[PDB]
Write an enzyme that holds these catalytic residues in place. Structure first.
Site, PDB file in Angstrom:
ATOM      1  CB  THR D   1      -0.999  -0.047   1.169  1.00 49.20           C
ATOM      2  OG1 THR D   1      -1.672  -1.347   0.618  1.00 49.20           O
ATOM      3  CG2 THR D   1      -1.703   1.481   1.451  1.00 49.20           C
ATOM      4  CG  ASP D  17      -0.789  -0.463  -3.547  1.00 46.89           C
ATOM      5  OD1 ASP D  17      -1.536   0.536  -3.297  1.00 46.89           O
ATOM      6  OD2 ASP D  17       0.090  -0.187  -2.854  1.00 46.89           O
ATOM      7  NE  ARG D  19       1.929  -7.243  -4.535  1.00 48.96           N
ATOM      8  CZ  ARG D  19       2.945  -7.237  -5.753  1.00 48.96           C
ATOM      9  NH1 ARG D  19       3.889  -7.473  -4.230  1.00 48.96           N
ATOM     10  NH2 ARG D  19       3.333  -7.426  -6.382  1.00 48.96           N
ATOM     11  CE  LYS D  33      -4.220  -0.147  -1.678  1.00 48.01           C
ATOM     12  NZ  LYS D  33      -2.952   0.213  -1.542  1.00 48.01           N
ATOM     13  N   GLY D  47      -2.537   2.460   4.788  1.00 48.25           N
ATOM     14  CA  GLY D  47      -3.500   1.554   5.817  1.00 48.25           C
ATOM     15  C   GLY D  47      -4.275   0.610   6.559  1.00 48.25           C
ATOM     16  CB  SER D 129       4.367  -0.217   3.317  1.00 44.83           C
ATOM     17  OG  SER D 129       3.905  -0.549   2.126  1.00 44.83           O
ATOM     18  CG  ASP D 166       7.249  -1.420   0.124  1.00 42.81           C
ATOM     19  OD1 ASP D 166       6.615  -1.384   0.969  1.00 42.81           O
ATOM     20  OD2 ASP D 166       5.414  -1.565   0.019  1.00 42.81           O
ATOM     21  CB  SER D 169       3.576  -0.861  -2.515  1.00 40.14           C
ATOM     22  OG  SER D 169       2.644  -0.516  -1.063  1.00 40.14           O
TER      23      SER D 169
END
Ligand SMILES: CC(C)(C)NC(=O)C[C@H](NC(=O)CCc1ccccc1)C(=O)NCCNC(=O)c1cccc(-c2ccccc2)c1
Lengths: 201, 196, 233, 219, 240, 230, 232, 204, 213
Positions: D1, D17, D19, D33, D47, D129, D166, D169
């Site tokens: 995220t 993203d 995922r 999102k 989050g 993240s 990352d 994500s």
């Protein structure tokens, strides 16, 4: 503290020792442990004292309200069950109350055990308190439902006697009542150690 | 400790329990009864933490009797099991978590006999036979070895004495005498207490 | 129409005046206080032979030393009786002693003018008690008979008649009573006055009788005792 | 995220993203999102996914009702205010680190509201993240008054850096261009990964599965 | 303030709750509604007052509501109050299905509601519901059932009854023409169209001036069905 | 604290007199008209406009409740604002709970319930408005009429307010099931035009339409266009 | 909430709402009971024969517990409320005492309840008189009458409902120890009583029966009709 | 882990206008297999099944409350619940217990009532509705099912190949788990019929 | 961690004779390792017949005595008579128990004259749990004063000793000599002695000096 009670041909005798020990210290050693609710009810006490005094006295208050309202002299079932509800309300609140409700109702000598948790037990032989097990041992080997009142009393004195002999938290004098058909009558409030010397020689 | 057991054959339910109510080392009572007669055809078997058993299960008993006095008939055992399941679940997260394990053995005139299990987390599960306590760990495999869906109630009692003899041989706790009741279309039959 | 808490042009609550008129329809009860204790006799006024005579109980126990006679709306006085019972027993629990009569009649007297129709957090009482009680008993101060009424005023009385024929009967109380009276004389006298006032012919069924003596608890005279006392007529 | 934002001359643009993991395992591959708030005010979600969903949906309702009430466009100040009072009342348990953006009569405004309630207007931001890489590239290439094309490629560089750099994500990047004229949800802007095919067909002829009990119910 | 209180929860000088009996006047002016209890099913037949105008008929029926898997209810009189009562019954029966995992019998449901209507009729001072209800529902204890409840909270089981306009003539015709335990579903249809033909004084009976929904058993499941218009024209024509 | 007893009591004849009177109040309200086409629903209501001082664009009788529902009333205005805010509240609760646009039959059920709660609660009078709720979803038109008594009727086309009887008789001879939306609007505006008394303008009659694209008010330009050809 | 004082004294000391509730009872379907040696019988007049009627759901003789049943008369809905409250309270008594309720307990309960609604805010008095009959655990028969005023009494045999004056005159005349020596003389006593007031000897009340330590027994109308011809 | 107290895993899968829902049948306390016919796939309509997993009491409690709100919906409405509506309902219901969460991880599988488009979705124990297109899983042994499904799933499989795929998915996926298995139940949801099938799983 | 109980020491003492009841306590109010005041007498005259001691957490001593006296005027108002020692004992049991879950940490010892003019002493504990004794110590130095009061007052473990009734003077010298025996050894006892004698004549107060160090 060690408190026992059994019933036989001639009623129910409940024997209680008379020491009350705050931890390792002996606070008082001629305590009266058996709260007398009615002319013919009888409830002992054990564990933390204030719980037994307050809740069992309050039990006497409920019984008196009953006897004034219905005028029919509340029975042992309603007694132990009602105290069972006073305990079951405050479940796990820390109340340490292990007690017994002796009496005489229409069905006969009703002996009940009412625990801090809500345990409620009719029965023939009980023994509560920190030194209950010893009183079990000396009662059973020497119990038989055809005992006369004399052999019953001596059996109690042997029970509470040795129960306070091997125990640390028990001693003083032994109270022992006799819940007859027409109500209790205090049979003795005997010294213990003198008994143990009468039993050692 | 406390050991329930229940088997469900063609036309009955033969539940059995132990008769000990202990206090931490000593059997304070060896004539205690762990089976609470709900109605004419419904036994409730409750074991676990003291106080929860009598209080809870008598609450259920009084609600069922109330139902029969309100409507002139009794709860079918499915209804009673899902009812006690409701109270135990609604009380699972509440101020008063009752830690009781149940078996509400029953026989209905229509649907036939059924033996509802219930762990203390309100998990309901109909089963042809169940158990509780540590003795379940030594008996359920025995019932699996000997159970058959067409078992006759005499064979049921024989099986049940095989299980209980196994407890007297192997299980660690002094469980001397066991209550045993049967339930059929004629109601409850207080059969002879098994001793050792 | 007006409220329950209205004062008339004379200065009395309406509901207490109309209520104290409602007590005037009840069956006449009478009790008398003596230095030996206090007795209580009340006419049952049986309505039909199909009734159970032991059903009408107008002289009930409040504790081991307090007998509560009543007259009027017998239904209303149940909350008073149970109130007093819970009171004296809580007093015994907390303070470890029997409760004085003045304390009891004062506590139960606290409920009369506790009535209204706008404060009402519960569905509290919506009218004054249509009950006239006569708490009798003995304490460390000894025998005492406290009248009470719907208006909540509890007053100490030597001997008082309440109910339907309370007017005349009370004239008989001032006529006959004297401080040095003995308790059996009290019983005989009160039964004489009731026999004066009752419509039906008196017998041991359509009345009751209780006393509370310094060593004796509250006690209701059975049929045979009542007959034995009525042999004097 | 790894969600990010950006502000250029005409309006804002939000990245995201696609995922959503379950503690070690990529649960979804195409989770949305860029949620909806008002007809031109969008709210990205980082989050705790459940709490961003529920929070932004409730506030979506209050801004719809309000929007019919005042007979006007909703102002992003309102959305951020209700979001941060709702988030603040719960004392940060509702870990829904929104990044709300929109275009008011005042101009493009890209707020960022963290889980305890601390909001902060600012021209570029990236939550989640992958806020490290996204903050990196946005820091490195941002300019006041960018072209919408440079904004799109720039943000895609950002959320891309989150994707590759990352763990939690991945999938595709989603950017939504908001302007004074209206919103355009440019779903699945770029698709870095290509692994979608394979070379092993794993078929079992009917009958290879041992079936015990059966039943069919016509409807 | 006390000038304004209507005192809807008091007896009269002769012991008659004025608001409950006035409500009985209101339902007395409502459209007639009657169902019949038979062996193979149960049917309800209610005079509609949505007769005929530019109405749309967006719903499946007017006075018939579905209460659970296994029941149906017909209201009469105050439409809104009938709505509140229907919603309340759905809530009751679904709480019973939550708390027992079986359908709720008709008797328990009717008692649960009638305790409510009684509750308003006793205290709180609110006006009582002026809405009479006829219920139909199957349960594994007692079979097909018909329950009439009225504003006073009183209810009773019936084999066929009619509430509303000309209820007297309707119950009269049922007394003359009900064959206890021998009425079939189709016999019930014919009789119901008989009573509604004689009572409804608006004059030539149409398919538009009534609706009928029947409940029966089918394959261990209960079916609650409304009669399409073709069947209604068919059954009235058959009645001719 | 407030009065707790119902102010609406069954008259000795059993007909709730307060709802008779409230219905008389709606009967005196400004005329309104609604008609359901095959693809949508029209709402046009008369502006009882006093002095030209009024900013007519300041407040409207035909308020949207969501993207697909409307409202017109007949009678007491402020009461109508109450029911509008309540309806917007309800549709928003439904949208939060189920994540779907509220079906109009539902919304009319709830708002009908709220109109009923005050015929029975303590010390409140019934409303004085008769709503017309038009709604579109499932590819289908809806038009309901709620009254002070709380009951709601599903209509093809209806009229309310001043002279609603002659309005309804005007619709019985002029509504046909296959009427497209614009010709529906023509029929409604003619319906009001029967008893307008005042030479309608694009300022003093409002027009609302609900079709698959959603609900909205027709600006006085467009309504002026429809006020052409009449 | 509604907190007006409905029941208030009047300018004679009367509670007019109570006299009016008792008026509602005086129009109730006449009921009667009697207290025998080992049996307790209740009879509820006819009420509403109505050939389409269902019998089972229109009776006035509900069960309160294994040993406590009750008639009534008047506002039947209200009596349904009181019956329900009494049932819940019986079971709560078995929860808190383990002993089945004496008839005195449940009757004095319901009398308390009726007394409260005679004397609270915004509540009308019940229009029900309940003749609760039952067996104490010792097995003695019990007849307690409770009226809207709340005053209750033991009774040998008392009649409630419309015309309770003439019927009560009947039990005053015919209640004798020869009358209740046996079951059938008892039940022919009850039905012999209502027959002065029943609508032609009947069905047109059917009754109910309770035997010592035996659950409530009802009658079908055949065995009622045997007694019918036996008395007519 | 409170979730694995009873074990058990349910998956759905999407195919040719038919979505197939599976489940294991082992109701067990931690290590003690207690029952082999514990129901986890509760119908919510003619063509809509909501398979739950996790702690048993939240299985049955969420299923029963959901059936409550669903019967109220269908009655108060005029229609069976569309799958997306049902998803938002269940998500609302789990989320009302945001801080006392039901330990249930439902997956909803079914068809549109009118158009009959396939539908699935999984949720977490606080209600993050995650509609998908290929499949979902839920329960103590999620990972093995992600492997077997992710390797076996293919676009546009008709019902029968669907039963093969979900069959082998559940079998292989539960056999490598201790706290699940004891048989497998499978439901195919076509446009016109609904096939229930249990599978031969390792009884150990 | 905030701790709501602190042991402010100071010992009380109570004895019952045939016609009186002494109550005595040291007035050192210690805490930790200091001396707040060398004067804070721990006996509180409740009525004309009842002298109540309080040791332990000084705050709960103040609050508890204040609540008791408030209850005495409540009783006197609703009953027209002061509480005896019996009633004060029971009432202080329900006061001390009604906080069973966050106790008053105050060792009471109520000494006084019952209505028979005879001695009576009701020693308590922090959670209720009373009794009637003939003598009692409480507080910090209870364990050093209790056995000696068994000896010279209970006459236990003696042989050939006449159990003479407890005379007021010999009870006095017992009180003072035992508090000296505690002052030598107990750290929390000293700095004063507040001996209150109870008789039918009222309450006469007597103080004594002790070790200050
Ligand atoms: C001799 C006198 C009259 C002073 N009371 C205490 O010391 C009571 C003694 N109770 C305490 O120290 C209170 C300790 C405490 C400190 C802080 C918070 C809560 C409790 C106590 O009982 N300690 C052992 C537990 N209880 C018992 O062992 C026990 C068992 C059976 C009966 C009695 C008993 C009851 C009433 C009177 C006499 C004895 C006590």
């Amino acid at each position: 503290t060690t408190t026992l009670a059994f019933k036989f041909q001639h009623g129910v005798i409940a024997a209680v020792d008379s020491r009350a020990s705050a931890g390792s210290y002996i606070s008082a050693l001629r305590v009266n442990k058996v709260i007398e609710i009615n002319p013919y009810l009888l409830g002992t006490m054990s564990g933390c004292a204030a719980d037994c005094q307050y809740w069992e006295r309050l039990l006497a208050k409920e019984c008196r309200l009953y006897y004034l309202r219905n005028g029919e002299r509340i029975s042992v079932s309603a007694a132990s069950k009602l105290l069972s509800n006073m305990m079951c309300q405050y479940r796990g609140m820390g109340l340490s109350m292990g007690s017994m409700i002796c009496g005489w109702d229409k069905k006969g000598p009703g002996l009940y055990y009412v625990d801090e948790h809500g345990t409620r037990l009719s029965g023939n032989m009980f023994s509560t308190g920190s030194g209950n097990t010893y009183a079990y041992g000396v009662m059973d080997s020497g119990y038989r439902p055809n005992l006369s009142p004399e052999e019953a009393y001596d059996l109690g004195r042997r029970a509470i006697a040795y129960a306070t002999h091997r125990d640390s938290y028990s001693g003083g004098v032994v109270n022992m009542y006799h819940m007859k058909e027409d109500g209790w009558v205090k049979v003795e409030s005997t010294d213990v150690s003198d008994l143990l010397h009468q039993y050692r020689e | 400790m406390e050991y329930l057991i229940g088997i469900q054959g063609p036309d009955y339910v033969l539940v059995a329990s132990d008769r000990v109510a202990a206090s931490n080392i000593v059997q304070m009572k060896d004539d205690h009864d762990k089976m609470f007669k709900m109605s004419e055809k419904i036994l409730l078997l409750c074991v676990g933490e003291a106080g929860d058993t009598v209080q809870f299960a008598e609450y259920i008993q009084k609600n069922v009797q109330l139902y029969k006095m309100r409507n002139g008939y009794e709860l079918s055992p499915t209804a009673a099991a899902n009812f006690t399941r409701r109270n135990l679940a609604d009380c699972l997260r509440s101020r008063t978590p009752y830690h009781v394990n149940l078996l509400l053995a029953g026989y209905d005139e229509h649907e036939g006999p059924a033996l509802y299990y219930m762990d203390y987390l309100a998990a309901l599960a109909k089963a042809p036979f169940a158990a509780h306590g540590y003795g379940a760990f030594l008996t359920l495999s025995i019932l699996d070895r000997y159970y058959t869906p067409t078992i006759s109630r005499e064979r049921a009692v024989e099986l049940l004495r095989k299980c209980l003899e196994e407890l007297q041989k192997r299980f660690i706790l002094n469980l001397p005498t066991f209550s045993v009741r049967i339930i059929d279309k004629n109601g409850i039959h207080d059969l002879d207490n098994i001793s050792f | 129409d007006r409220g329950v808490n209205t004062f008339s042009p004379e200065g009395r609550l309406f509901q207490v005046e109309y209520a104290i008129e409602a007590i005037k329809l009840g069956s006449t009860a009478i009790g008398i206080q003596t230095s030996e204790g206090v007795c209580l006799a009340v006419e049952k006024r049986i309505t039909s032979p199909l009734m159970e005579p032991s059903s009408i109980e107008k002289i009930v126990e409040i504790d081991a030393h307090i007998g509560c006679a009543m007259s009027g709306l017998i239904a209303d006085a149940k909350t008073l009786i149970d109130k007093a019972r819970v009171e004296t027993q809580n007093h015994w629990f907390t303070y470890n002693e029997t409760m004085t009569v003045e304390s009891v009649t004062q506590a139960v007297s606290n409920l009369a003018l506790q009535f209204g129709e706008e404060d009402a957090d519960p569905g509290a009482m919506s009218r004054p008690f249509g009950v006239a009680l006569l708490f009798g008993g003995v304490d460390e101060k000894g025998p005492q008979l406290f009248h009470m009424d719907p208006s909540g005023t509890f007053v100490q009385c030597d001997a008082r008649a309440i109910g339907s024929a309370s007017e005349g009967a009370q004239s008989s109380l001032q006529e006959v009573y004297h401080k040095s009276m003995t308790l059996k004389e009290a019983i005989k006298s009160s039964l004489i006055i009731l026999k004066q006032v009752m419509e039906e012919k008196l017998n041991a069924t359509n009345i009751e009788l209780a006393t509370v003596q310094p060593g004796q608890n509250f006690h209701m005279f059975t049929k045979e005792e009542l007959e034995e006392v009525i042999k004097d007529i | 995220t790894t969600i990010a934002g950006l502000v250029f001359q005409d309006g804002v643009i939000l990245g995201a993203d696609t995922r959503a993991t379950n503690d070690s395992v990529v649960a979804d591959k195409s989770c949305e999102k860029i949620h909806f708030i008002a007809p031109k005010i969008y709210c990205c979600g980082a989050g705790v996914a459940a709490d961003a969903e529920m929070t932004t949906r409730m506030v979506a309702s209050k801004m719809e009702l309000h929007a019919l009430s005042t007979g006007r466009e909703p102002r992003v100040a309102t959305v951020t205010r209700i979001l941060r009072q709702t988030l603040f009342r719960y004392q940060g348990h509702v870990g829904a680190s929104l990044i709300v953006g929109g275009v008011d009569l005042t101009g493009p405004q890209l707020y960022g509201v963290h889980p305890h309630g601390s909001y902060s207007r600012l021209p570029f931001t990236a939550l989640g993240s992958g806020q490290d890489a996204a903050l990196a590239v946005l820091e490195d290439r941002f300019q006041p008054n960018m072209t919408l094309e440079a904004a799109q490629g720039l943000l895609v560089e950002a959320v891309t850096a989150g994707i590759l750099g990352d763990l939690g994500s991945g999938g595709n990047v989603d950017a939504c261009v908001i302007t004074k004229t209206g919103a355009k949800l440019l779903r699945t802007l770029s698709s870095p990964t290509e692994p979608v095919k394979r070379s092993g067909r794993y078929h079992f002829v009917p009958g290879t599965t041992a079936v015990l009990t059966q039943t069919v119910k016509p409807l | 303030s006390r000038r304004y209180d209507s005192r809807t929860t008091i007896f009269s000088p002769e012991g008659r709750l004025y608001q409950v009996e006035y409500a009985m006047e209101a339902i007395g002016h409502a459209g007639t509604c009657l169902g019949i209890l038979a062996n193979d099913g149960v049917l309800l037949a209610a005079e509609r007052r949505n007769i005929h105008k530019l109405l749309d008929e967006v719903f499946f029926s007017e006075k018939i509501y579905k209460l659970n898997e296994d029941m149906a209810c017909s209201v009469a009189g105050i439409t809104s109050d009938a709505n509140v009562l229907t919603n309340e019954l759905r809530l009751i029966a679904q709480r019973y299905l939550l708390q027992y995992q079986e359908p709720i019998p008709c008797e328990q449901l009717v008692t649960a509601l009638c305790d409510i209507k009684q509750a308003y009729t006793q205290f709180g001072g609110k006006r009582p519901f002026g809405v009479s209800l006829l219920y139909i529902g199957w349960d594994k204890h007692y079979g097909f059932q018909l329950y009439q409840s009225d504003p006073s909270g009183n209810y009773g089981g019936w084999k066929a009854t009619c509430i509303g306009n000309n209820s007297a003539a309707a119950v009269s015709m049922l007394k003359q023409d009900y064959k206890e335990g021998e009425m079939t579903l189709k016999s019930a249809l014919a009789l119901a169209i008989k009573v509604l033909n004689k009572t409804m004084d608006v004059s030539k009976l149409s398919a538009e001036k009534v609706e009928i929904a029947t409940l029966t058993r089918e394959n261990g499941k209960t079916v609650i069905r409304v009669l399409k218009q073709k069947e209604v024209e068919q059954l009235i024509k058959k009645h001719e | 604290r407030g009065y707790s007893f119902s102010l609406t009591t069954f008259s000795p004849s059993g007909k709730l007199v307060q709802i008779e009177y409230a219905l008389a109040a709606v009967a005196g309200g400004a005329p309104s008209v609604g008609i359901k086409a095959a693809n949508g629903v029209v709402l046009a209501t008369e502006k009882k406009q006093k002095s030209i001082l009024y900013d007519e664009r300041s407040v409207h009788k035909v308020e949207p409740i969501t993207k697909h529902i409307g409202l017109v009333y007949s009678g007491m205005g402020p009461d109508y604002r109450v029911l509008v805010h309540r309806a917007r509240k309800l549709a928003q609760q439904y949208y939060l709970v189920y994540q779907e646009p509220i079906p109009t039959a539902q919304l009319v059920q709830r708002v009908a319930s709220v109109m009923q709660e005050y015929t029975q609660s303590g010390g409140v009078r019934p409303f004085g408005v008769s709503l017309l709720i038009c709604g579109w979803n499932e590819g289908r038109p809806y038009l309901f009429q709620s009254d002070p008594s709380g009951a709601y009727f599903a209509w093809k086309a209806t009229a309310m307010g001043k002279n609603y009887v002659n309005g309804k008789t005007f619709l019985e001879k002029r509504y046909n099931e296959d009427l497209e939306l614009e010709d529906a609007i023509h029929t409604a505006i003619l319906t009001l035009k029967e008893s307008f008394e005042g030479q309608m303008t694009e300022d003093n009659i409002e027009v609302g339409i609900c079709n698959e694209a959603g609900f909205r008010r027709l600006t006085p330009t467009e309504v002026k266009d429809y006020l052409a050809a009449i | 909430s509604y907190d007006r004082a409905i029941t208030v004294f009047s300018p004679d000391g009367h509670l007019f709402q109570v006299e009016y509730a008792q008026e509602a009872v005086k129009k109730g379907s006449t009921a009667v009971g009697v207290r025998g040696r080992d049996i307790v019988v209740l009879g509820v007049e006819k009420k509403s024969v109505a050939k389409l009627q269902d019998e089972r759901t229109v009776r006035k003789i509900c069960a309160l517990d294994d040993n406590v049943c009750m008639a009534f008369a008047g506002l039947t809905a209200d009596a349904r409320i009181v019956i329900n409250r009494a049932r819940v309270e019986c079971q709560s008594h078995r929860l808190t005492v383990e002993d089945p309720v004496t008839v005195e307990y449940i009757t004095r309960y319901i009398a308390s309840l009726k007394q409260r609604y005679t004397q609270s805010n915004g509540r009308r008095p019940f229009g029900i008189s309940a003749l609760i009959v039952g067996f104490d655990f010792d097995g003695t028969p019990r007849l307690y009458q409770t009226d809207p005023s709340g005053t209750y009494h033991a009774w040998k045999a008392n009649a409630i409902g419309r015309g309770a004056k003439s019927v009560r005159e009947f039990l005053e005349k015919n209640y004798t120890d020869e009358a209740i020596e046996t079951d059938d003389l008892t039940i022919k006593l009850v039905i012999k009583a209502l027959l002065e007031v029943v609508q032609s000897g009947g069905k047109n009340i059917e009754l109910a029966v309770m035997r010592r330590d035996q659950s409530l027994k009802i009658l079908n109308p055949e065995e009622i009709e045997k007694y019918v011809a036996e008395i007519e | 882990s409170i979730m694995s107290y009873n074990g058990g895993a349910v998956m759905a899968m999407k195919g040719k206008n038919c979505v197939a829902i599976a489940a294991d049948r082992r109701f067990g306390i931690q290590a003690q297999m207690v029952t082999t016919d514990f129901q986890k796939i509760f119908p919510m309509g003619d063509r809509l099944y909501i398979g739950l997993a996790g702690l048993a009491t939240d299985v049955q409690t969420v299923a029963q409350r959901l059936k409550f709100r669903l019967n109220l919906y269908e009655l108060k409405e005029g229609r069976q619940i569309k799958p997306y509506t049902l998803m938002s309902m269940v998500a609302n219901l789990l989320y009302e217990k945001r801080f006392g969460p039901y330990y249930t991880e439902p997956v909803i599988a079914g068809l549109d009532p009118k158009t009959f488009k396939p539908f699935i979705c999984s949720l977490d124990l606080i209600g993050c509705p995650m509609v998908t297109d290929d499949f979902v899983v839920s329960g103590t042994c999620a990972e093995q099912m992600y492997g077997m499904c992710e390797s076996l799933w293919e676009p546009n499989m008709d019902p029968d190949h669907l039963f093969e795929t979900i069959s082998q998915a559940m079998l292989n996926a539960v056999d490598r788990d201790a706290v699940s298995g004891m048989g497998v139940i499978v439901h195919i949801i076509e446009k016109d019929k609904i096939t229930t099938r249990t599978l031969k799983a390792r009884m150990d | 961690r905030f701790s709501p109980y602190v042991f402010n020491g100071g010992t009380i003492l109570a004895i019952a004779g045939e016609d009186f009841a002494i109550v005595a306590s040291d007035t050192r109010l210690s805490e930790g390792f200091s001396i707040h005041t060398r004067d804070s007498p721990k006996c509180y005259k409740l009525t004309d017949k009842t002298v109540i001691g309080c040791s332990g957490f000084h705050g709960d001593c103040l609050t508890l005595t204040k609540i008791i006296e408030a209850r005495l005027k409540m009783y006197k108002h609703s009953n027209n008579k002061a509480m005896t020692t019996g009633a004060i004992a029971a009432m202080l049991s329900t006061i001390l128990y009604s906080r069973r879950f966050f106790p008053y940490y105050v060792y009471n010892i109520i000494g006084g004259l019952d209505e028979e003019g005879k001695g009576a002493v009701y020693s308590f504990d922090p959670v209720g749990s009373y009794q009637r004794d003939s003598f009692k110590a409480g507080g910090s130095a209870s364990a050093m004063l209790q056995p000696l009061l068994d000896n010279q007052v209970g006459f236990k473990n003696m042989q050939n000793v006449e159990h003479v009734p407890l005379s007021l003077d010999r009870a006095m010298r017992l009180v003072k000599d035992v508090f000296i025996s505690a002052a030598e050894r107990d750290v929390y006892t000293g700095d004063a002695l507040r001996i209150c004698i109870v008789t039918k004549e009222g309450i006469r107060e007597e103080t004594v000096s002790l070790r200050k160090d």
